[PDB]
Structure 1
Amino acid sequence: FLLACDKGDYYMVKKILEENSSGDLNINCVDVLGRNAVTITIENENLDILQLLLDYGCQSADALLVAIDSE
Structure 2
Amino acid sequence: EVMALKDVREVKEENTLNEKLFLLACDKGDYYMVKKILEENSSGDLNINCVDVLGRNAVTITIENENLDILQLL
Pairwise same-fold verdict (TM > 0.5): yes
- Counting matched residue pairs gives 53
Q: Which amino acid is the alignment partner of residue 8 of structure 1?
A: G
Superposition pairs of residues 1-71 of structure 1, within 5 angstroms: 2=22, 3-21=24-42, 23-53=44-74
Contact 2:40 2:46 in 1 (8 A): no
- Quote the sequence identity (%): 96
What 5-or-longer segments of structure 1 have no aligned partner? 54-71
Q: 1:32 to 1:22 in 2, by over 3 A?
A: farther
| Contact 2:63 2:71 (8 Å CA) reproduced | yes
TM-score by length of 2: 0.61
Q: Return the alpha-carbon distance in structure 1 between the equivalents of residues 46 and 28 of structure 2.
A: 16
Amino acid at match of 2:54: L
Q: Which has more strand, going by share of residues?
A: 2
CA RMSD in angstroms, aligned pairs only: 1.7
AA aligned opposite 1:16 = I
CA distance 1:22–1:34, change in 2 (3 Å) = farther
> TM-score, with normalisation over the residues of structure 1?
0.63
Gaps of 5+ in 2: 1-18
Structure index of larger Rg: 2
